[PDB]
């Protein structure tokens, strides 16, 4: 109920960063990681690269390649 309610609020946020499309897409990418595949090593590596991608600003040029990598993995 803790992580649930807080995930509720954070997806409300990733919605509300512009009403939609804010982040709004990387919990869908969490689901996309969870659905297709994976072996456990690439699973852990993709979740660590996601955790690298999360905290930072979206306009940075490191977040450009750290998004394209998670898009080529899944």
């Amino acid at each position: 109920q803790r992580e649930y309610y807080l995930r509720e609020q954070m997806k409300a946020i990733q919605k509300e960063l512009g009403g939609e499309d804010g982040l709004s897409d990387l919990e869908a990418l969490r689901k996309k990681i969870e659905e297709v595949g994976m072996p456990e090593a690439v699973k852990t590596k993709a979740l660590k690269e996601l955790d690298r991608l999360e905290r930072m600003q979206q306009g940075s040029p490191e977040a450009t390649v750290a998004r394209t990598y998670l898009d080529w993995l899944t």
């Binding site: 109920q1 803790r2 309610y5 807080l6």
Partner: protein
């Protein structure tokens, strides 16, 4: 119970012995209302799921249905037949003619008295105390003061658990799950666990409220 004309719920679930007005908009359901009047003011109410298969069928439905006595019959021709029903008891479904209008029976009553009546009255009193605290904890929704005065005057704990869960706002799935199991103590612990987890939500609310206070005061 004996193939009453099934009239669909279009909203949240009726629980036993709840003073409930029922909207009946679709004409497919409306002649099932007039011959529920032709069925001695008793409907084997079988709820369906939301946004709804508005072709009447057993396919629509929820396999645990409530019995309900009509209190009064409103001739209100506003595209939706208004009927007030006080409920009786949940039931397990035993047949289906489809519809409009369906024919479907049930079996059981919500009269259940588990043994060791001490544990009955104790978990009843602890659900009572959970409700008395929760209604004090959630006047953020400003719950009703007659929902304290009418829950005093209760003598069958089954409809007590049903009236308390009905007064408490939940999902459709939770109310249908309360109507699936027939037992007292399970529905008691059900309402109790739901109140406790909403209290944990409320605690998270107080927590982030203090966080916002911190941010505003610091900045």
């Amino acid at each position: 119970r004996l193939e009453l004309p099934v009239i669909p719920l279009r909203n949240t679930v009726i629980l036993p012995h709840t003073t409930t007005p029922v909207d009946v908009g679709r004409a497919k359901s409306k002649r099932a209302v007039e011959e529920a009047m032709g069925a001695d003011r008793l409907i084997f109410l079988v709820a369906q799921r939301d946004p709804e298969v508005d072709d009447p069928a057993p396919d629509d439905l929820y396999t645990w249905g409530v019995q309900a006595v009509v209190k009064q019959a409103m001739r209100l021709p506003d595209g939706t037949l208004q009927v007030m029903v006080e409920a009786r008891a949940r039931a397990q479904v035993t047949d289906y003619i489809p519809g409009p209008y369906l024919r479907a029976r049930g079996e059981v009553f919500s009269e259940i008295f588990p043994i060791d009546e001490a544990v009955v009255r104790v978990l009843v009193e602890e659900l009572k105390e959970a409700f008395e605290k929760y209604v004090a904890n959630h006047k953020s929704l400003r719950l009703d003061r007659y929902q304290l005065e009418a829950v005093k005057g209760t003598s069958d704990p089954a409809m007590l658990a049903d009236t308390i869960a009905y007064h408490a706002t939940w999902t459709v799935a939770e109310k249908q799950e309360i109507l699936e199991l027939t037992d007292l103590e399970a529905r008691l612990k059900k309402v109790l666990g739901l109140l406790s987890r909403d209290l944990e939500r409320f605690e998270l609310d107080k927590r982030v409220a203090q966080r916002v206070k911190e941010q505003m005061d610091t900045n």
